[PDB]
Design an enzyme around this catalytic site. Structure first.
Site, mmCIF file in Angstrom:
data_model
loop_
_atom_site.group_PDB
_atom_site.id
_atom_site.type_symbol
_atom_site.label_atom_id
_atom_site.label_comp_id
_atom_site.label_asym_id
_atom_site.label_seq_id
_atom_site.Cartn_x
_atom_site.Cartn_y
_atom_site.Cartn_z
ATOM 1 C CB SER A 10 39.231 25.833 14.404
ATOM 2 O OG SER A 10 38.194 25.453 15.283
ATOM 3 C CD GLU A 151 33.532 33.859 25.612
ATOM 4 O OE1 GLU A 151 34.604 34.445 25.871
ATOM 5 O OE2 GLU A 151 33.265 33.402 24.480
ATOM 6 C CB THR A 184 39.122 39.846 25.253
ATOM 7 O OG1 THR A 184 37.993 38.986 25.107
ATOM 8 C CG2 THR A 184 40.284 39.032 25.876
ATOM 9 C CG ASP A 228 40.442 32.422 17.809
ATOM 10 O OD1 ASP A 228 39.979 31.856 18.833
ATOM 11 O OD2 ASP A 228 39.868 32.416 16.702
HETATM 12 N N1 LIG Z 1 34.927 45.814 15.864
HETATM 13 C C1 LIG Z 1 36.064 45.961 16.542
HETATM 14 N N2 LIG Z 1 36.622 47.169 16.681
HETATM 15 C C2 LIG Z 1 37.753 47.323 17.347
HETATM 16 N N3 LIG Z 1 38.380 46.300 17.903
HETATM 17 C C3 LIG Z 1 37.880 45.064 17.802
HETATM 18 C C4 LIG Z 1 36.690 44.863 17.111
HETATM 19 N N4 LIG Z 1 36.432 43.557 17.135
HETATM 20 C C5 LIG Z 1 37.407 42.961 17.816
HETATM 21 N N5 LIG Z 1 38.289 43.867 18.217
HETATM 22 C C6 LIG Z 1 39.556 43.581 18.932
HETATM 23 O O1 LIG Z 1 39.552 42.176 19.247
HETATM 24 C C7 LIG Z 1 39.489 42.018 20.674
HETATM 25 C C8 LIG Z 1 38.606 40.824 21.050
HETATM 26 O O2 LIG Z 1 37.247 41.065 20.678
HETATM 27 P P1 LIG Z 1 36.303 39.919 20.049
HETATM 28 O O3 LIG Z 1 35.013 40.603 20.286
HETATM 29 O O4 LIG Z 1 36.962 39.820 18.730
HETATM 30 O O5 LIG Z 1 36.763 38.772 21.087
HETATM 31 P P2 LIG Z 1 35.901 38.239 22.346
HETATM 32 O O6 LIG Z 1 34.572 38.191 21.691
HETATM 33 O O7 LIG Z 1 36.333 39.303 23.275
HETATM 34 O O8 LIG Z 1 36.719 36.848 22.366
HETATM 35 P P3 LIG Z 1 36.110 35.351 22.287
HETATM 36 O O9 LIG Z 1 34.735 35.251 21.752
HETATM 37 O O10 LIG Z 1 37.176 34.480 21.447
HETATM 38 O O11 LIG Z 1 36.214 34.776 23.790
HETATM 39 C C9 LIG Z 1 38.983 43.350 21.233
HETATM 40 O O12 LIG Z 1 39.585 43.550 22.513
HETATM 41 C C10 LIG Z 1 39.653 44.322 20.264
HETATM 42 O O13 LIG Z 1 41.029 44.483 20.625
HETATM 43 C C1 LIG Z 2 35.493 27.534 14.195
HETATM 44 C C2 LIG Z 2 35.936 28.925 14.669
HETATM 45 N N1 LIG Z 2 37.210 29.128 15.035
HETATM 46 C C3 LIG Z 2 37.633 30.311 15.441
HETATM 47 C C4 LIG Z 2 36.777 31.406 15.516
HETATM 48 C C5 LIG Z 2 37.356 32.749 15.956
HETATM 49 O O1 LIG Z 2 36.595 33.327 17.026
HETATM 50 P P1 LIG Z 2 36.757 34.882 17.414
HETATM 51 O O2 LIG Z 2 35.871 35.683 16.335
HETATM 52 O O3 LIG Z 2 36.347 35.172 18.808
HETATM 53 O O4 LIG Z 2 38.289 35.281 17.137
HETATM 54 C C6 LIG Z 2 35.447 31.219 15.155
HETATM 55 C C7 LIG Z 2 34.453 32.375 15.282
HETATM 56 O O5 LIG Z 2 33.280 32.175 15.576
HETATM 57 C C8 LIG Z 2 35.023 29.967 14.718
HETATM 58 O O6 LIG Z 2 33.743 29.779 14.303
HETATM 59 MG MG LIG Z 3 37.581 32.599 19.258
HETATM 60 NA NA NA Z 4 37.880 36.549 24.637
#
Ligand SMILES: Nc1ncnc2c1ncn2[C@@H]1O[C@H](COP(=O)(O)OP(=O)(O)OP(=O)(O)O)[C@@H](O)[C@H]1O
Ligand SMILES: Cc1ncc(COP(=O)(O)O)c(C=O)c1O
Ligand SMILES: [Mg+2]
Ligand code: NA
Ligand SMILES: Nc1ncnc2c1ncn2[C@@H]1O[C@H](COP(=O)(O)OP(=O)(O)OP(=O)(O)O)[C@@H](O)[C@H]1O
Ligand SMILES: Cc1ncc(COP(=O)(O)O)c(C=O)c1O
Ligand SMILES: [Mg+2]
Ligand SMILES: [Mg+2]
Ligand SMILES: [Mg+2]
Ligand code: NA
Lengths: 305, 305
Positions: A10, A151, A184, A228
């Site tokens: 995106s 996931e 992650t 991302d």
């Molecule tokens: N609230 C937070 N506090 C600390 N670190 C965070 C936080 N949110 C995200 N992160 C950082 O971002 C990384 C990825 O977390 P997020 O929850 O953002 O991705 P995901 O949900 O793991 O990925 P996706 O949904 O794209 O597959 C975590 O490993 C951490 O390094």
């Molecule tokens: C359209 C779109 N792109 C990118 C993202 C980034 O996702 P993430 O919060 O895991 O980095 C989101 C989050 O929901 C999204 O809605």
């Molecule tokens: Mg994402």
């Molecule tokens: Na991830």
């Protein structure tokens, strides 16, 4: 000479998600990343409002065709993330297959975005018909996948309640094809305290396994684009440190640390004491983190399981 | 923080439009939001190219989203190659509202109309755009960057000498913009014929409150090749360096022109080593010029006029 990346994600005008969160960072690290914008929205869907248009599978193929006609269909990496359309994802699959026949050494970095866990158990935010394609088509093609706990569970059919179960589920995903699996984020418990989230990483490569764990201090807020950013940085660091999952993960997570640290500070100053920052105030301070992306100060050692 | 809304084209491969302008501005610390007016596989100077365009309605919609979230607050607006009149009119309405939201907003407009190939010049945009630029766009612009052919189209006068150029520059000022830079011209150079000439003129009110004008000239040696995107990069950097040196056109222009030089030099050398260099080999080596963008070593000094 050049490490080219075809990143299909995106694009938003205001903010940092998908290609907006992935591009600047990779460019800063010297990668010739080409951005195919799967959608163009005013901003991410975490806001009260949002507008935009999408790119249908025919338009994506049209773009790939233009590149092929010019013989510019040779990439060292492919990076994909969130997609809501099944047709689009299938078209993406054909493209990677093609790019792989064009260059056998291509590394496909797939972020199998399907949903997340909230308070305890989570929910999907992608149509369900997508899961089968990810399991059957996408993941087997992927060389590196970055699912979060939810996931990883969906893609394996197994629930993860402990570190051991997570590593077993990762073994399953490995057998599905990817040599590098990095969860992650997860609800796993940390000895460090309740205010932590766990990252687990597994890399197959004399066929040897390397497994790591990292305990990350939770910041009090919901960020968008971080998953991302994680995938893109993992792409960059596994590139500079092949066969060293440990360091690659430490630079990736540390980079996230600095960005979020810088982001939560600004968010507060703007929101004011005691007020929770809005999504707008919580947008990644990406350009201001340039030096942290170039050479992140390692602020997290990863443990070797 | 300095916010820029840049409405220009996007390509998958290469650097033109928003691809030539975004990375450098981000490197410089600008919060630049890119509205992609088109999404093509590559620039149209290649043998083939495919892609889709954004229509005025979708642009309006994307803008409605920013507005619905109160994210229509910008310090700068940057526009370049626009292919459609209804689009340009939509861009005009957007810049007006933004200027109303913020009277200090600076509109940097590259009035892309055409260019000169050897002796003769011709347009490469619909002719019905010229009246819109003349009566609607330029009057709203604070900084314009036309090439010689465009200053001639906008002023309605031909330019055969430095003197005629300066008069059209005053004409251009009277139409609206306080900063006029003619980014290229085949005017005579006392250094030879293989030189292109840059002219700059800026009107500003000094501390005492007197309205004065700074005028400069630069004699750039021509390289043997056609580059696409350099005009876009020029406008982008002009924005960046006049932002840094608001009362010093000479320095702003010297850093802008020096940055192109470093970029073009790196590009010309990694095209010769590949070859004549085809369009692909002449793509601006953007990512590799990071250091030069951040702090350009001044290699050409401007003549004070
Ligand atoms: N609230 C937070 N506090 C600390 N670190 C965070 C936080 N949110 C995200 N992160 C950082 O971002 C990384 C990825 O977390 P997020 O929850 O953002 O991705 P995901 O949900 O793991 O990925 P996706 O949904 O794209 O597959 C975590 O490993 C951490 O390094
Ligand atoms: C359209 C779109 N792109 C990118 C993202 C980034 O996702 P993430 O919060 O895991 O980095 C989101 C989050 O929901 C999204 O809605
Ligand atoms: Mg994402
Ligand atoms: Na991830
Ligand atoms: N062949 C070249 N040799 C040396 N410098 C060049 C060459 N082409 C472009 N440049 C650099 O890029 C600048 C912009 O010129 P270009 O011809 O690229 O844009 P323009 O045609 O001036 O702008 P526009 O986008 O409005 O048509 C020149 O002033 C110079 O700094
Ligand atoms: C869509 C688009 N954007 C940008 C450019 C680059 O313009 P310039 O070389 O004047 O910077 C071109 C070339 O004509 C173009 O077709
Ligand atoms: Mg998450
Ligand atoms: Mg030109
Ligand atoms: Mg242009
Ligand atoms: Na110009």
């Amino acid at each position: 000479e050049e490490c080219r990346v075809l990143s299909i994600q995106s694009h938003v005008i205001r903010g940092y998600v998908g290609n907006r969160a992935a591009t600047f960072p990779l460019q800063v690290l010297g990668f010739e990343i080409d951005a195919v914008n799967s959608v163009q929205f005013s901003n991410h869907t975490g806001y009260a409002h949002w507008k935009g248009q999408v790119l249908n599978s025919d338009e994506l193929q049209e773009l790939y065709e233009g590149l092929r006609l010019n013989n510019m269909n040779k990439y060292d990496y492919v990076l994909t993330g969130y997609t809501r359309d099944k047709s689009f994802l299938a078209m993406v699959v054909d493209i990677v297959q093609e790019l792989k026949q064009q260059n056998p050494r291509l590394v496909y970095v797939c972020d199998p975005v399907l949903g997340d866990k909230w308070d305890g158990e989570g929910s999907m935010y992608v149509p369900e018909d997508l899961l089968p394609v990810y399991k059957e088509k996408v993941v087997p093609l992927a060389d590196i996948i970055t699912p979060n706990q939810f996931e990883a569970e969906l893609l394996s059919g197994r629930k993860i309640h402990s570190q051991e179960e997570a590593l077993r589920v990762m073994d399953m995903l490995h057998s599905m094809g990817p040599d590098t699996v990095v969860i992650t984020s997860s609800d796993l418990p940390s000895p460090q305290g309740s205010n932590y989230l766990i990252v687990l990483g597994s890399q197959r490569r004399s066929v040897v396994m390397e497994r790591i764990r990292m305990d990350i201090r939770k910041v009090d807020a919901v960020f968008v684009g971080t998953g991302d950013l994680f995938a893109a940085m993992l792409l960059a660091w596994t590139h500079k440190h092949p066969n060293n999952l440990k360091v690659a993960c430490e630079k990736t997570v540390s980079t996230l640390h600095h960005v979020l640290q810088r982001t939560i500070q600004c968010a507060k100053a703007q929101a004011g004491e005691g007020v929770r920052p809005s999504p707008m105030q919580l947008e990644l301070r990406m350009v201001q983190s340039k030096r942290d992306i170039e050479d992140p100060e390692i602020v997290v050692q990863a443990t070797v399981l």
